[PDB]
Paper text:
EV-D68 is an atypical enterovirus that usually causes mild respiratory tract disease, but is also associated with severe lower respiratory tract infections and acute flaccid myelitis. Following receptor binding and endocytosis, virus particles uncoat by forming a proteinaceous pore spanning the endosomal membrane through which they eject their genome into the cytosol. Structures of EV-D68-947 were determined after incubation of the virus either in the absence of a receptor analogue, with 6′SLN (a sialylated trisaccharide), with dp6 (a heparin-derived hexasaccharide), or with LMWH at 33 °C.
Full and empty particles in cryo-EM images were counted. e Structure of EV-D68-947 empty capsids formed in the absence or presence of LMWH. VP2 residues 53–60, 98–100, and 240–242 and VP3 residues 148–150, which line the hole around the two-fold axis, are less ordered in emptied particles formed after LMWH treatment than in those formed without ligand. Incubation of EV-D68-947 with sGAG analogues not only caused pocket factor displacement but also promoted genome release, by enlarging the putative openings for genome egress at the two-fold axes via a yet unknown mechanism.
Author numbering:
A (entry chain C): 17 to 27, 32 to 42, 53 to 222, 224 to 242
B (entry chain A), E (entry chain A): 53 to 78, 87 to 129, 135 to 289
C (entry chain B), D (entry chain B): 1 to 175, 184 to 234, 236 to 246
F (entry chain B): 1 to 50
The structure:
């Protein structure tokens, strides 16, 4: 439970690291679930990707601690929930890619500022089979990942530790992680369904230096 | 090692990274090389299995010599000078910058064993960001994935001897070999062919295997 | 001083040698080792992670459609759905996995693999699948009744949603040559019973991870990578 | 005797190597170490000494006039006097100091600098100066009222004659490229109140010293020195 | 070292100090060199950060050879002889003074590794007066700043072989590298360009930077 | 055997060096040191004589 906004209930972690503080350390301002917009998962939906903390420069006391702090240091605690009934079938891969250097298809030109920086809007995979960077989705379970199989569960929980070689980073140009939700098995029902996928990001162990 | 699957043993095979048959006669009289991971795609695909690395590269300059289509091969003196990511490179073959009292040259003859220096962990951060999801500097014009805390350095190599060296072409091989490798956060192996040495663009082959829409070669049916 | 003589093999550059060498910038203190999460000390931590097989391997399977095998209500009672040739050193479903991209950097692999399938249909979808493991050299089953020969399990995906199928020791390339190295075969047992509101075309996805006894040795370069000229050529010079 | 073989990298002159070598005049006793005062064992004793910044950096500031910023009775109540760009690796007020001529022999600098200003007006001169530290990437203040954003101090030079302004950790060249690396900004707060006998044009001088946590690493040659032919050329030959 | 700011590490980079492509044929057949601090202004500006020094210079003679605009390069024998501040230098290339039983020659071939001797702390006083505010000797004609307790020595180098060596020009590089450096009383770094190798004259550039009346490049105003 | 590499300054004849060297007639016993009067162990015994 994080912040005055009681949203979801957690205690799956990642990299064996529950976040601890390894100066401004927010614990009631930023440590709260910033629920994003719920994206409509249909039958022909390819994927979605949110680059953290680029998705949180806009929203909340974390967003004020980006515009008023030059260097940040934060781990995350993320929570994806896919509210579908007992007649929907489908499977998501909620994968959290560290340093997702995306690729541009078929050209020699690197991605620009308006292909990598989206923010709260998120984005969408174009070739999700190779994760938009030439690798493979079939091997993409080496990351911190979690399965939303709508037969079994409908929710996910990944913890994202501080993933930089640097001790602290500046937020408006670099993005550590990349939450990415790829429907492996596409959604099915006979009526032919816009099932929503709600993403709540909660920062953990925030530090901010340089007013 | 204990097993042959250990990361110190998996990566520290000495690999060729540069090969410049530079012609010296009486800019083009020498070569430099930006030391980067992204040279030869046999080693590049192994270093891009990991996100963060921390390796002391050793550099083993092998210098040969060959007569063009005079019967003896002259034993020249060379200079492989490691310019880091800091001060200037020599603009000419015999400029002032070769005589620098800070860039650490080596002075090796051809008839010696191959020269060998060990460039240490050369970064600002605690690891090499192989993949960088950000932008350099401040502008929107900073290219994607280019971190200044990733360039190991430069390696300007020249023939120390004076001109009129007549048409014996000098082919210089340079072998990088990581040491003390500590590797963090593994990644999926790249399955589509490369486009550039700068970024992770993807095009695929025309048909499977290693294509965009089908990575394994197509069998006839699932009951094959 | 010290009377020394040169052995044969003196002055050679053997590429896989390991001696201490001359540092090019001594009295340099590199940046200390900040605790970065998720270290790999051994590539058998990378292999033992599960990863999706590509079990719908047919022609005209485009992109994401290749990973998942569709079962439906209009399949025969004991129609063969798929089979997985265990060519971890060759072409097949196992080539683009974690267990089969690290093991293409090696020559001899050996150990128990572990398959895990996961049904991805609706909550009401019931039926059974029989999952046969054919040991190598044996006969690939066609009838469901002659499929009972070695190890096989009847998997009811109405109750379970995921089964784990241990493949035993295989010992690898102990014989470059095409042969018969195992199969994992999955027939329909009953039918697909979905109600009138769920979609009648359900799907399976399959995973593979090596176990603790997996052992790779003798290192070679990967056959996967090669082909053409790259962009920014000579731009590092 | 001893069977030895030559490693690759044998017979090379690496310029930064450190082995014991052959003395050209052995059995020579050089002059003993007489205790000469003021030894430097570390260049961070040379850096941490304060030294004058050059904060009046304009055109037509000739010679000694460049070190001191003139304030006077005919300046606006909140007119900007100066700002100090913290380009310790580049051009600016900090280039000809002790902290910024040793740190041009290096590549990565990092630590708390320490600025010290000293008012040099008459004994009766009163007024206040507000001294803003703008952290890097931030906005350079123009109005005195929006100048209250980060660290800033109101310095009354009627009471004090010297203020100490710690600049915090900066970490240096962690990003050769122009950017925004800090500012120290000093506005008028009140006015300059000198009596009718003292001179109405007072002056400030500013100092900078690195603190104990200053750290330089990776050594390169200085960009400052170069250009022309020297006298007594070949007179040492 | 413990830090890279330590004085032993700050100064002991090996720097080029002499380079004489002396032509030997059948005074001018050899070269000498007065060993002094004031040779190359990249190292000179670092030694003039301090007032008093105490360093064992090592000298690493690198000898190359090159054919002029005959296909093989002859492997000659050389002699780098350290004449201190005492007895006479050889006036010719083959005089009697090369055969001296007190000057400590080295006899190195071209095809060897580069020769290397270590000249110890060579002074009369307890330190090298880099800056001397006095006058030599007794007269008013003693020049300013020239201390006889500052000359390290001389370094006469010749080709040992006899004449008729035909037009292969011999370029000889000499690398000085201080050792065991103890440095006393630091100084302001010199900001104006040099005039001579003898004294500290100052002229400045024409305009800023590094000019007489303005050392930092002029910005437009103080509120820039 | 022993992996060795040649330093720069290898193969040079420095005239004032002092290493043990190869005796040209080993297993020769030279004449023992008969006590000859007036030994000079230091040239400052020669200088201090008037």
């Amino acid at each position: 439970k994080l912040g005055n906004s009681a949203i979801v209930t957690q205690e799956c972690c990642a990299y064996g690291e529950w976040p601890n503080y390894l100066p401004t350390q927010p614990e009631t301002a930023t440590d709260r679930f910033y629920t994003l917009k719920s994206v409509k998962w249909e039958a022909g939906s390819t994927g979605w990707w949110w680059k953290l903390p680029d998705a949180l420069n806009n929203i909340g006391m974390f967003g004020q601690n980006v515009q008023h702090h030059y260097l940040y240091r934060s781990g995350f605690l993320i929570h994806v929930q896919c509210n579908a009934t007992r007649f929907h079938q489908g499977a998501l891969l909620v994968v959290a890619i560290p340093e997702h250097q995306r690729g541009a298809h078929n050209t020699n030109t690197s991605p620009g500022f308006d292909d990598i920086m989206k923010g709260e809007e998120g984005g969408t995979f174009n070739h999700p089979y190779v994760l938009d960077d030439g690798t493979s989705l079939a091997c993409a379970t080496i990351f911190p990942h979690q399965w939303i199989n709508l037969r079994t569960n409908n929710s996910a929980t990944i913890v994202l530790p501080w993933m930089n070689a640097a001790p602290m980073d500046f937020p408006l140009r670099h993005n550590q992680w990349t939450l990415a939700i790829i429907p492996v098995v596409p959604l099915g029902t006979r009526t032919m369904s816009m099932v929503p996928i709600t993403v709540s990001i909660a920062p953990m162990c925030c530090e901010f230096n340089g007013l | 090692g204990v097993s042959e699957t250990l990361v110190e043993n998996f990566l520290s095979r000495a690999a060729l990274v540069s090969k410049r048959s530079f012609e010296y006669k009486d800019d083009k009289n020498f070569f430099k090389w930006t030391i980067n991971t992204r040279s030869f795609v046999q080693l590049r695909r192994k270093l891009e299995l990991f996100t963060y690395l921390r390796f002391d590269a050793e550099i083993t300059i092998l210098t040969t010599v060959a007569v063009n289509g005079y019967m003896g091969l002259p034993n020249l003196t060379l200079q492989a000078m490691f310019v880091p990511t800091g001060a200037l490179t020599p603009e000419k073959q015999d400029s002032f910058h070769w005589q620098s009292g800070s860039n650490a040259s080596v002075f090796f003859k051809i008839s010696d064993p191959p020269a060998r220096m060990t460039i240490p962990f050369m970064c600002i951060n605690s690891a090499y960001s192989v993949f960088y999801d950000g932008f350099a500097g401040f502008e929107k014009s900073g290219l994607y994935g280019i971190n200044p805390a990733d360039t190991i350095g430069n390696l300007c190599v020249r023939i120390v001897n004076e001109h009129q060296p007549v048409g014996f072409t000098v082919t210089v091989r340079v072998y990088m070999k990581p040491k003390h490798i500590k590797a963090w956060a593994p990644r999926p192996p790249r399955t589509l062919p490369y486009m550039s040495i700068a970024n992770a663009n993807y095009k695929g082959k025309k048909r499977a295997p290693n294509a965009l829409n089908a990575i394994i070669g197509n069998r006839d049916s699932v009951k094959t | 001083g010290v009377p020394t003589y040169l052995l044969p093999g003196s002055g050679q550059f053997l590429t896989t040698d390991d001696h201490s060498s001359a540092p090019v910038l001594p009295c340099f203190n590199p940046t200390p080792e900040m605790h970065i999460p998720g270290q790999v000390r051994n590539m058998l931590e990378v292999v033992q992670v599960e990863s999706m097989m590509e079990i719908n391997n047919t022609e005209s399977a485009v992109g994401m459609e290749r990973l998942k095998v569709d079962i439906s209500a209009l399949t025969d009672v004991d129609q063969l759905l798929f089979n997985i040739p265990l060519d971890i050193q060759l072409d097949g479903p196992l080539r683009n996995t974690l267990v089969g991209n690290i093991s293409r950097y090696y020559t001899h692999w050996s150990g128990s693999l572990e398959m895990t399938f996961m049904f991805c249909g609706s909550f009401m979808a019931t039926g059974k699948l029989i999952l046969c493991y054919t040991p190598p050299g044996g006969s690939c089953p066609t009838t469901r009744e002659t499929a009972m020969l070695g190890t096989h399990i009847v998997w009811d995906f109405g109750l379970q949603s995921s089964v784990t199928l241990i493949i035993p020791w295989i010992s690898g390339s102990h014989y470059s040559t095409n042969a018969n190295v195992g199969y994992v075969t999955c027939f329909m047992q009953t039918n697909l019973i979905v109600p009138s509101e769920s979609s009648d075309t359900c799907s399976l996805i399959g995973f593979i991870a090596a176990k603790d006894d997996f052992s790779l040795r003798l290192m070679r370069d990967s056959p996967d990578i090669g082909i053409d000229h790259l962009h920014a050529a000579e731009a590092a010079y």
